[PDB]
Every structure is written in C-alpha cells, then in structure tokens.
Paper text:
Among BacNavs, NavAb, cloned from Arcobacter butzleri, is the most critical contributor, since its full-length structure of Nav at atomic resolution was first resolved. Here, we elucidated the mechanism of the divalent cation block by reproducing the blocking effect into NavAb, a well-studied tetrameric sodium channel. NavAb has three ion interaction sites in the selectivity filter, a high-energy-field site (SiteHFS), a centre site (SiteCEN), and an inner site (SiteIN). Our crystal structures of NavAb mutants show that the mutations increasing the hydrophilicity of the inner vestibule of the pore domain enable a divalent cation to stack on the ion pathway.
To reproduce the divalent cation-blocking effect on NavAb N49K, we introduced L176N (L176NNK) and L176Q (L176QNK) mutations which imitate the selectivity filter of NMDAR and AMPAR, respectively. The amine group of the mutated L176Q side chain forms two weak hydrogen bonds with the main chain of Val173 and Met174 of the P1 helix. These interactions make the carbonyl group of the L176Q side chain face the centre of the ion pathway. By comparing the electron density of the L176QNK and N49K mutants for the same ionic condition, we can find that the L176Q side chain is responsible for the increase in electron density below SiteIN with and without calcium ion (b: brown mesh). In the non-calcium condition, the differential density at SiteIN of the L176QNK mutant seems to interact with two oxygen atoms of the carbonyl group of the L176Q side chain and Thr175 main chain. It suggested that the L176QNK mutant can stabilize sodium or water molecule in this site more than N49K mutant. Hydrophilic side-chain mutations provide hydrogen bonds to molecules around the SiteIN of the selective filter, allowing calcium ions to stack at SiteCEN, the centre of the ion permeation pathway.
Author numbering:
A (entry chain A), B (entry chain A), C (entry chain A), D (entry chain A): 999 to 1090, 1097 to 1226
C-alpha cells in the first residue's frame, strides 16, 4: 500500500517497540503497586484507568502487528504468546493470569528473547530422560499408593498424593524426618522403597545435568 | 523350519512388538486405575479379566521369543528382565512387584532402551568411588553407633540405624536441627563427628559428579 | 620530588604492605576477641587502645597511597574499597559494618585478589539469566501475593513476603511440609503454582551453572 | 643381607599383602559384630582374643616394613598412616578411633589408593577459594554474633555457635523456617544479613565446583 509502507515502517521502527516496552514497564510497576491496600484506596482509580488505557494500546498494536504480517504472526512463537496474553487481559483465576503479560517484556527485549530461546533449545535432548523419569515416577507412585495408602492416606492415599510425596522425597525436603521415619513406625522396612528410590532419582537427575553440559560444549569443541 | 521362518518373521516384525507395546500401555493405565476404590467397585471385573487376558498374551509371546532365540534369550539383559517380570506376574509384596512389568515399556521402546543403557555404562567408573564411600560409611556408622547408641537409640542404636541417620545427614535433610543439635544437648562436641563427615561426603560426591562429566566428554574431544 | 621518590619507594615497597597485612591480621584477631564478654572485661582497654592505634595507621597509609597516586587511587576498585572501609571505621549498624575492614586482607594479598577478580569476571555472563529470574520472581511474587495473601498473611501477605517465601521454595527449604502442604488445607490446588514454579526455577539455575562451565572452558580449548 | 633379601622378598611379595588384607577384612567384620550386645555376650571372648591376635600381626608387619625401608617408611604418606593407626590401636575416644584402622584397607588396595590420591591432588587448587570462604565465614560469624548474640544466645551467642548456624544456613538446612524466620520476630530485617550471605556462599561454592571441572578437563584436552 501507500500507507501500508508507512505502517510497516512504524511497526518495525525502533521507537514503536521502545514505546510498548515503556508501557510494559509502567504496567508492571502498576501491577506491583496494586497489591498495596493503602495505595489502591488512595490512587486506585488512576491505576485502573491506566490499566484500561494501556490494555487498549496493546490491543491496537496487536491489531497492527497482525495486519503487517497476516500469517507470519500466527506461526511465530513470541507474537503468538503476545496474542494469548492480550487475549487473557481482555475478558471482562483470570485476574491473576493477567500478570503473565509482564513476560511480554521478555518478548520485546531481544537479549531476553535470546536467553529464553537458548533455554528452550536445551529441552529436546532431555525428552528421553524425562520420559524414563515420568514412567519411573508412575511406577513408584503406584507402588507407594498400594503399600502405604491406607495407613498413610494424607501422603500416599491417592496416586496424585503419591506423585506429590515422591516429588518431595526427590527434592529431599523432609524426606526422612517428615515421611520415611514416621512410616517406619508402622511399616519398619520403608527404606527399601525410598533409599533405592532416592538413589535412582538422584543418579538420573545427575546424568540429566551432565547431559546438558556435553550438548552445550559440543558446539564449542568443533 | 517352514513355519519357523514365518514365526521368526513375525516375532521380529514391527507389528508384533508394536502390539505388545499397546498392551503394556493398556495394562499400565489399567494398573493405574486399580488404585481407585470407586473404579474397582464399578469395573473391577473387566479389569481383572483384562489383566488375565493380557498376562496370557505376554507369557505366550515370551514362549515365542524363547523359541526363535533359544540361548540368545538368556544371555540378553533386556529379554532376561522380561523373563523375570513375566515370572513375577505369574505366581498365584509380589502384588506390588507386579507393577514392575511397566518397565517392560523401557525394554520394548528403543529410544528408552538407549537412554537406560547409557545410564548403565556410566556406572563402571563410579565403582572405585562407591567402594571408598561404602567403606567410609561403614567406618563412621560404627563410630556413630558406639558413640551415640545408648543415649540416642532411635537414631544410632544399631549399625543399620546409623547407616540410616548418616545417609540422612549426607542428603543434608534436618542434619542440624533434626540430629546434631539435639545430640549436642547431651554430647556437646558432636560437630567434630558430623561437620567433618559432611565435608568428606560432599567432597567425594562432588568428585563423583565431576568424574561423570570427564568420562562423558572424552569421546567428544577425540 | 626528592622525598616523593622516597615515599613512593616505600609505599610500593614489599615491607610497607607486609606491615599493613600484619596489622590487618592483628586487628582481625582483636575483633575476634571482642565478642568474649570475659576477655573484654579483662583486657578491653588494651584492645580498644589497639583499635585506635591501628585505625590511625590505616588512615595515614590511605593518605600516603592517595598522595603517590592522586587520581589512580579513585579509579581502582581495590583501593576504592579501602577508602570506604577506612571511612566507615572513622565515624564516631556502623559498629558491625566496621568488621568489613577484614576484607582489607583480600585486597592486600595478591593471590586472594586474583581469586576475587576471577569470581567477578564470571558475573557479566549471568546478567541476562539473572534478569529473566528477577522478572520471573517479580511475576510469581505478584501472583502468590494476590492468591494467598489474605488467608496466609505471614508468608504471602506482602510482595516482599512473597519474594521471601518463593526464595525459600527455590532453595527447597521446607517447600512442601512448611509452605505448600499447609496451603493445601485451605487452597487444595497450590501445587499447580509451586511445582511448576520449582521446575522453572531449577531448570534456569541449572543452566546458569552450565553456562558458567562453558564460559570457563572456552579459554582452555582455544 | 642373606635373609634380608628373603624378608624383603616376602614383604614385597603379593601373598604377604594379600594376607594382611584378609586380616583387615576379618577385623572389619569383627569390629562390625562388636556393636551387637547379644553377639558380644555369646562370642565376646573369641572376638577380643581375635582382636589381640590380629593387632599383634599388624604390629610385627609394621616392624618388618620399617626394617626393609628404614627411612623410606617415614616419608611415605600411606605407611605413615599405617604407623599411626597401629599406634592408636596399641595404647592400653581412643576406643572409637581404633576403627580408623579399617582405612588400612584403602592403603593396601591399590585401586583404592589411586582414587584417594586423585581426590587429594584436587585439593591444592581449592586452597585459594577455601581461604576466601574461611575469611568470609570469619567476618560474617563476627557480624552475626554481635547482631543476634544476646536475643538468640543458643544460635549466635558465641563465635563458634555463629560459625555453626552460618554453616547450617550455607547447607540450606532449615535456613528460613529454623533460623531466619524466628529471628525476624525480634529483628525484622535479618534477611539483609542472610539472603546476601546465602547468595555469596552459593556463588563461591558453585565456582569451586566449576573450578574442579576445568582443572580435571585440562589434562584431557592437551
Ligand atoms: C523486577 C524487580 C524490581 C524490584 C521489585 C521491588 C519489590 C518491592 C516490594 C516490597 C514492598 C512491600 C513492603 C511494604 O511494607 O509495603 C506495604 C504494601 C502492602 O501493605 P499495605 O497494603 O500498605 O498495608 C495495609 C495495612 N492495613 C490493612 C491495616 C490498612 O506493599 C507495597 O507497598 C508494595 C510496593 C510496590 C513495589 C513495586 C516495585 C516494582 C519494582 C519495579 C519492577 C518493574 C518490572 C517490570
Ligand atoms: C521462561 C519464561 C516462559 C514464559 C512462558 C513462555 C510460553 C511460550 C513462549 C514461547 C517463546 C519462545 C519460543 C522459542 O524460543 O522457540 C525457539 C526454540 C529454540 O530454537 P533453536 O532450537 O535454537 O532453533 C534451531 C533449530 N532450527 C534451526 C532447525 C530451527 O526452538 C524450540 O522450540 C526447540 C523445541 C523444544 C520445545 C520445548 C518447549 C516446551 C517446554 C515448556 C512447556 C511449558 C508448557 C506450559
Ligand atoms: C517436557 C517438559 C518437561 C516436563 C517434565 C515434568 C513432568 C510433569 C509430571 C506430572 C505428570 C503427572 C501429573 C499427575 O499425575 O498429577 C497428580 C497430582 C494431583 O493431585 P490430586 O490427587 O488432584 O489432589 C486432589 C485432592 N483431593 C482429591 C482430595 C481433593 O499432582 C502431582 O503430584 C504432580 C507432582 C509433580 C510430580 C512430577 C513427577 C514426574 C517428574 C519427572 C521430572 C523429569 C525431570 C527429572
Ligand atoms: C506416565 C504418567 C502419565 C500421567 C499419569 C496421570 C496420573 C493421575 C493420577 C491422579 C488421579 C487421582 C485423583 C483423584 O481424585 O482420583 C480418585 C481416585 C482415588 O479416590 P477414590 O478411590 O475415587 O475415593 C473413594 C472414596 N470413598 C472411600 C469414600 C468411597 O484416584 C484415581 O481415580 C486414579 C485415576 C487413575 C489415573 C491413571 C492415569 C494413567 C495415565 C497414563 C499413563 C500410562 C503409562 C504407561
Ligand atoms: C554399584 C551400584 C551402586 C550401589 C551404591 C549404594 C550402596 C548401598 C549401601 C548399603 C550397604 C549396607 C546396607 C546396610 O548396612 O543396611 C542396614 C540398614 C537396615 O536397618 P535395620 O537395622 O534392619 O532396621 C531394623 C529395625 N529393627 C531391628 C529394630 C526392627 O539400611 C540402611 O540404613 C541403608 C541406608 C543407605 C546407606 C548408604 C550407605 C553407603 C552409600 C554409598 C553411596 C555411594 C555413592 C556416594
Ligand atoms: C579465619 C578463621 C581462623 C579460625 C577462627 C577461630 C574461631 C574460634 C571461635 C570459638 C571461640 C568461642 C568458644 C568459647 O567457648 O569462648 C567463649 C567466648 C564467649 O564466651 P564468654 O564471653 O567467655 O562467656 C561469658 C559468661 N558469663 C556471661 C556468665 C560471664 O568466645 C571467645 O572466647 C572467642 C574467642 C576468640 C577466637 C578468635 C580466633 C581468631 C582466629 C584468627 C583469625 C584471624 C583472621 C584474620
Ligand atoms: C547482578 C548481581 C546478582 C544479583 C542477583 C540477586 C537479585 C536480588 C533480588 C531482590 C530484588 C527485589 C528486592 C525486594 O523485592 O525486597 C523485598 C523483601 C523485603 O520484605 P519487607 O516486606 O520489607 O518486610 C517488612 C515487614 N513489615 C513491613 C511487616 C515490617 O526482601 C526479599 O524477599 C528478597 C528475597 C530474595 C529474593 C531474590 C529474588 C530474585 C533472585 C534472582 C536470583 C538470580 C540467580 C538465580
Ligand atoms: C562395607 C559395608 C558392607 C555391608 C555392611 C552391612 C551392615 C549391616 C548392619 C545391620 C545389622 C543390624 C541389624 C540388627 O537388627 O542387628 C541387631 C544388632 C544390635 O542389636 P542387638 O545388640 O542384637 O539387641 C539387643 C537387645 N537387648 C538389649 C534387649 C538384649 O546389630 C547387629 O547385629 C550388627 C550385625 C553386624 C553386621 C556386620 C556386617 C559387616 C559387613 C562386612 C563389611 C566388611 C568391610 C571391611
Ligand atoms: C578419604 C579417606 C581419608 C582417610 C584419612 C587419610 C589420612 C591421610 C592419608 C594420606 C594418604 C594419601 C596421601 C596422598 O595420596 O598424597 C598424594 C597426593 C597426590 O599426588 P599428586 O598431586 O598426583 O602428585 C603429583 C605431584 N608430583 C608429581 C610433583 C609429586 O599429593 C598431595 O598430597 C597433593 C597436596 C595436597 C594435600 C592436601 C591434603 C590434606 C587434606 C585433608 C586434611 C585432613 C586433615 C585431618
Ligand atoms: C584445606 C582443607 C579444607 C578445609 C576447609 C574447612 C575449613 C574448616 C573451618 C573451621 C575453622 C574455624 C573452626 C572454628 O571456628 O570452631 C568453632 C565451633 C566450635 O563451637 P564451641 O563454641 O566450641 O561450642 C562449645 C559450647 N560451649 C562453650 C557452650 C560449651 O565449630 C564450628 O562451628 C565449625 C563449623 C564449620 C564451619 C566451616 C566454616 C568455614 C568453612 C569454609 C569451607 C570451604 C569450602 C566452601
Ligand atoms: C531432538 C531430540 C534429541 C536430539 C539428539 O540429541 N540427538 C538426535 C539426533 C542424532 C530427540 C531425538 C529423538 C527423540 C526421541 C524419540 O524420537 C522418541 C522417544 C519416544 C519415547 O517414548 C519418549 C520420547 C523420545 C525419547 C524422544 C525424545 C526426544 O524428542 C529425542 C531424544
Ligand atoms: C571399568 C572400571 C573403570 C574403567 C576406567 O575408567 N578405567 C580403567 C581402564 C583404563 C573399572 C576398572 C578397574 C575397576 C576397579 C578394580 O579393578 C577393582 C577395585 C577393587 C575395590 O576394592 C573396589 C572396586 C574397584 C575399585 C574396581 C572399580 C571399577 O570396577 C573399575 C574402576
Ligand atoms: C558481557 C555480557 C555477556 C558477554 C557475553 O557472554 N557475550 C557477549 C559478547 C559476544 C553482556 C553482553 C550483553 C549484555 C546484556 C545486554 O547488553 C543488555 C540486556 C538487557 C536486559 O534487560 C538485562 C541485561 C542484559 C541481558 C545484558 C546482560 C549482560 O550485561 C550481557 C549478556
Ligand atoms: C598448587 C596451588 C594451585 C596451583 C594452580 O592451580 N596454579 C598455580 C600454578 C600456575 C597453589 C598455587 C598458589 C597457591 C596459593 C598461594 O601460593 C598462597 C595463598 C595465600 C592465601 O592467604 C591462602 C592460600 C593461597 C591462596 C595459596 C592457595 C594454593 O596453595 C595455591 C593456589
Ligand atoms: Na529441610
Ligand atoms: Na535441603
């Protein structure tokens, strides 16, 4: 177009994205201030007005970005994320989910965008080890629920409660004073279940970490 | 044979192993559903029937696999594991040990098989460090049992209880509020035993991890 | 100058810096002894006299060092640190902040100076990951304060209290028995907030550590 | 000598060191059995006799080893350790220190000897970082003792008690529920002291570990 060139030369301009970055920061501090009961009584209307007069800017700039790249928008992870976080912020739990638009700042800022996509690119390698661990949790979740579910309903009564207690034991939070030692007052051989479980879960996780270290180092040694 | 070629051309076919994989998954979800008291009252007979009509399939397919490879079966770690997990599932604790046949899914799936055998191949290097640690635990288990066994019978009364408390201190779970600090109310110099113990156990474990990192990296730098 | 050469040939002499090192050590042991109520009653005056007759030496040697390097002093991180730790020790919380002049010993000793500046040079790389984590804490601090702030005021009532509880959960100290499990007595789905939070925070920190390992190894592989 | 060749050809023979290894193992199991009150009542005399008839063998074989290498013995770390652990076991706390002669098995066994000396060779590099950490603990031990020593005498009353509580906070055992959170009921800004302390102590330790990883990898990349 005649003006289509102008609008794609503003949408891809530095100052338009710098402006929506200042708005993300201002909204983030606004969102931060909205936890204060005293501030909300004193200036609640300026902030809620502000929150409206900023959600409108964000929605119009989503409209513009969609126009300049009609289908390129809906195949791009970052702009897709923007689409969804402005969608959440537009409906009349959702209240809390609205804060996620502050990750909008990870999208705009390129250095942050680089770090995030680096972290994502790590994941494909871990898929194989995660699958063994999820299967491993599934198997020991079922064993623990059938062994301790009656006498210890709060911790091992349900499969979900046993995926919870086992995750806590793997994080090694009160694994012994909190869970195993109380269990051994009724069932005196519970260590056979947990100390092996601990050992396996640690080993795998260690290897997971070492795996991440050689997949990173390969591109350097070449 | 005439049909022996047919049976070895089905046993090594893709679809026969895909079929026993679907059966492992169906049995795994069945086993998962058997923790629900409500589901077991409503559909317990369909599932127990299912569990029988699947343990039979698994046993016949073990029979077939043994026939096609008569001695190759009993020298192969994965099929040996299958032999034993279908054996456990065939006897009239065992109830819980039956769930282990879900690791049958690690055997069938090749990508999982790769990850598991990678994890195994790590272990030979750790044998030397594990032996020093097991000897180290043995020595400090005996010291702790003789020092605190009377006044603190629940934690250090027996060698096994002291291999337990020392493992908890090495995992650093309530090492200080839970065990050392109570001990210092009777025996005020217990830190000499534990803080050195902590230090040694951490150092060795750190080296263990670093060891795993150079044994992995060697095949890349070549 | 005529004597300016003499004073710059003492200020940069080995024995002048060896002397102020002995004074740092003597003051450090003095500072160590000043916690003892009994020693302070018995020899408090010798030590406070000593503390004065040493703060004067340190101040004159700051004066000398400033003279020999007039502007080189105020552009040098180590001597700048000396300026500020002798300033703190000169005013008529400050009492406790005075102990920081024992890090004066890191400045004088060159091997220590090397280690410290190595540790500093690591930091620039972590700036990108720290910024994502600080933003991530900010977002989940706000979510946690709005979700649990009323029913759990002590832990999540304020943004600062939620940056505190979330840091404790990331350190994995009583994350489950101490915070999540009590929360699930009122709000039974709190794991959705924390177990994801845990996962993200661990992953990032792991990568942070792996990052530090490849930035160190690069100068070796070249 | 005429027989001196014979005795140095037995002392350095495989079977003499294999024999004292069997004696270390037999004594280790004996020492293990001596925790059992029931076994000591039933067979206490056979074991104490055994313990004497083995401490004598060990002492004569120390005598022989000293003779074959008169001064080479007292300049060799492993045999020096043997000298001292047979000395401890010869005097008429010492009772518990006697168990250390089971590390005699690390000395005899060469693969174990290799692992141990590898672990030792790591340490020289950590000396610089350990010195910064020990100075760092000293400084924050003094700060914590002067800030919280009166209101919290059990944890921070003495410098030793503050080197204890700070070590526990660095191990991250009940750092927050156990120590900081109780402190903030009297002194509401204690996080300024501990969360910075935590951060520094973690960072340094991380670098310590990364250091160990590049000092190991250097001999491989060459
Ligand atoms: C990225 C990280 C940057 C740094 C983040 C800084 C976070 C600091 C938060 C700590 C503030 C809370 C401390 C405090 O005491 O403030 C009180 C209020 C809540 O208490 P309040 O509601 O005032 O008490 C009511 C009493 N009543 C019921 C009897 C009437 O609580 C507040 O006033 C909250 C104050 C809002 C702080 C917002 C700071 C935003 C930093 C900029 C980050 C932008 C990133 C895009
Ligand atoms: C930390 C704050 C998070 C905030 C919420 C985020 C929500 C999603 C936002 C997505 C924005 C980032 C997307 C992204 O960076 O993708 C790029 C990555 C890395 O690229 P990379 O792998 O380097 O590309 C090389 C491959 N090539 C050349 C053939 C194209 O390419 C890949 O994706 C590799 C494939 C692995 C994908 C695994 C992703 C899912 C893990 C977490 C799922 C959470 C669900 C709730
Ligand atoms: C590829 C990207 C990376 C993703 C990797 C993470 C995989 C996530 C695993 C979770 C999959 C299974 C989820 C699940 O089973 O949820 C069950 C429970 C819910 O408890 P629930 O029974 O609903 O409580 C209700 C109480 N009631 C009925 C009395 C009112 O909720 C829980 O307990 C979940 C606790 C977390 C357990 C994590 C277990 C496997 C993690 C493997 C980690 C891999 C790296 C090592
Ligand atoms: C590999 C990991 C994949 C993802 C795993 C998903 C795990 C999800 C488990 C969480 C389900 C439990 C939550 C829940 O509230 O369910 C209730 C039942 C047990 O309570 P219920 O017996 O219904 O209560 C009785 C009350 N009474 C005594 C008064 C009559 O508990 C149940 O109903 C259990 C529901 C069965 C879930 C099975 C999911 C299998 C996922 C597929 C994995 C296949 C791997 C090969
Ligand atoms: C090569 C493949 C890797 C394998 C490495 C793992 C080595 C496993 C070490 C276990 C060896 C010794 C086993 C043992 O001594 O068992 C004793 C206790 C049993 O307690 P017990 O006294 O039966 O309780 C009965 C209570 N009663 C009589 C009043 C009714 O049970 C326990 O306390 C065991 C607790 C675990 C302690 C682990 C100690 C050494 C681990 C070294 C780890 C190496 C990597 C760092
Ligand atoms: C770099 C690290 C080097 C090694 C650091 C060594 C730290 C050792 C500290 C442990 C000392 C405390 C143990 C102890 O029981 O001493 C008691 C005094 C405090 O109790 P006290 O005030 O005597 O009790 C009064 C009783 N009342 C109220 C009824 C009259 O507490 C004291 O007497 C404190 C003793 C001062 C020890 C100063 C050691 C400095 C080591 C040199 C480091 C120089 C680095 C530049
Ligand atoms: C580039 C060099 C490295 C630096 C990296 C570290 C970044 C430090 C993050 C701290 C920034 C935000 C500070 C902040 O928000 O302070 C709030 C609270 C204070 O609590 P407050 O509400 O004042 O308590 C008063 C109680 N009252 C009113 C009732 C009397 O105090 C806290 O809760 C702070 C707790 C620490 C939280 C740390 C959170 C982000 C850390 C990211 C770590 C990066 C590496 C993974
Ligand atoms: C290197 C690691 C190898 C594997 C280490 C194996 C450790 C196993 C230790 C667990 C044994 C303790 C379990 C148990 O219930 O035994 C009971 C006794 C102590 O109770 P007891 O004194 O029998 O009870 C008296 C009751 N009363 C007062 C009313 C009369 O406690 C005992 O009977 C202790 C049994 C001695 C076990 C010695 C095993 C040595 C393994 C070989 C290692 C050699 C390395 C050089
Ligand atoms: C784990 C069970 C322990 C049981 C108690 C042990 C008590 C002491 C037993 C001593 C036996 C081992 C002695 C030893 O292996 O020394 C050899 C190490 C490693 O040799 P390496 O550095 O490879 O030699 C190369 C240097 N070269 C070619 C120029 C000679 O050469 C070095 O020593 C390097 C120098 C660093 C020494 C740091 C040692 C002290 C750390 C722990 C102190 C604890 C005191 C209670
Ligand atoms: C080169 C080979 C590696 C060696 C590195 C390890 C360095 C060891 C540091 C210990 C140096 C200072 C020792 C010290 O100050 O001892 C004080 C306390 C003793 O408490 P105390 O006051 O005697 O309790 C008596 C109670 N009473 C009077 C009421 C009856 O005892 C404690 O609290 C000690 C707790 C351990 C603290 C460790 C602090 C610095 C560790 C730096 C670690 C470096 C790697 C990161
Ligand atoms: C990109 C990533 C790793 C790439 C790599 O490091 N090397 C591969 C290239 C050489 C890819 C390549 C192959 C992928 C696995 C399998 O396909 C399917 C498999 C099925 C299991 O039930 C659970 C998922 C499994 C383990 C997958 C995980 C992950 O998705 C892998 C490892
Ligand atoms: C394959 C594995 C490591 C291979 C490697 O990294 N380098 C070896 C090849 C060069 C092998 C090679 C040598 C093996 C040790 C000894 O034989 C026996 C020894 C007796 C002890 O009391 C306890 C077990 C010990 C430590 C064994 C551990 C482990 O089984 C080792 C390290
Ligand atoms: C020296 C350090 C890393 C050097 C490196 O490893 N490679 C860079 C050279 C190739 C430098 C180079 C680029 C720097 C970042 C950006 O400039 C600004 C950015 C803004 C964010 O909102 C928060 C800070 C960010 C992430 C900075 C972090 C840090 O300060 C970086 C990574
Ligand atoms: C062998 C070990 C490291 C070897 C290395 O990695 N590179 C050195 C060779 C190149 C050696 C070489 C130099 C040694 C330090 C200093 O001499 C004294 C110094 C005084 C402090 O107050 C406290 C101890 C310090 C930090 C020592 C630590 C350690 O003893 C070091 C690092
Ligand atoms: Na804990
Ligand atoms: Na912990």
């Amino acid at each position: 177009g005649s003006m289509y060139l102008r609008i794609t030369n503003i949408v891809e301009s530095s100052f338009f994205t710098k402006f929506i970055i200042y708005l993300i920061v201002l909204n983030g501090i606004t969102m931060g201030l909205e936890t204060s009961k005293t501030f909300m009584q004193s200036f609640g209307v300026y902030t809620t007005l502000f929150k409206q007069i900023v959600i409108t800017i964000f929605t119009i700039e989503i409209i513009l970005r969609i126009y300049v790249h009609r289908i390129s928008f809906f195949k791009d992870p970052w702009s897709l994320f923007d689409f969804f976080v402005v969608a959440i912020s537009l409906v009349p739990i959702l209240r809390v989910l609205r804060v996620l638009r502050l990750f909008r700042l990870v999208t705009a800022v390129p250095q942050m965008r680089k770090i995030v996509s680096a972290l994502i690119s790590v994941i494909p390698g871990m898929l194989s080890v995660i699958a063994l661990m999820t299967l491993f949790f599934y198997i020991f979740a079922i064993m623990a629920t059938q062994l301790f579910g009656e006498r210890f309903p709060e911790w091992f009564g349900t499969l979900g409660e046993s995926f919870y207690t086992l995750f806590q034991v793997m994080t090694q939070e009160s694994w012994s004073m909190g869970i195993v030692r109380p269990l051994m007052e009724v069932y005196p051989y519970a260590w056979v279940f947990f100390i092996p479980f601990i050992f396996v879960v640690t080993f795998v996780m260690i290897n997971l970490v070492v795996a991440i270290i050689v997949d990173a180092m390969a591109i350097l040694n070449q």
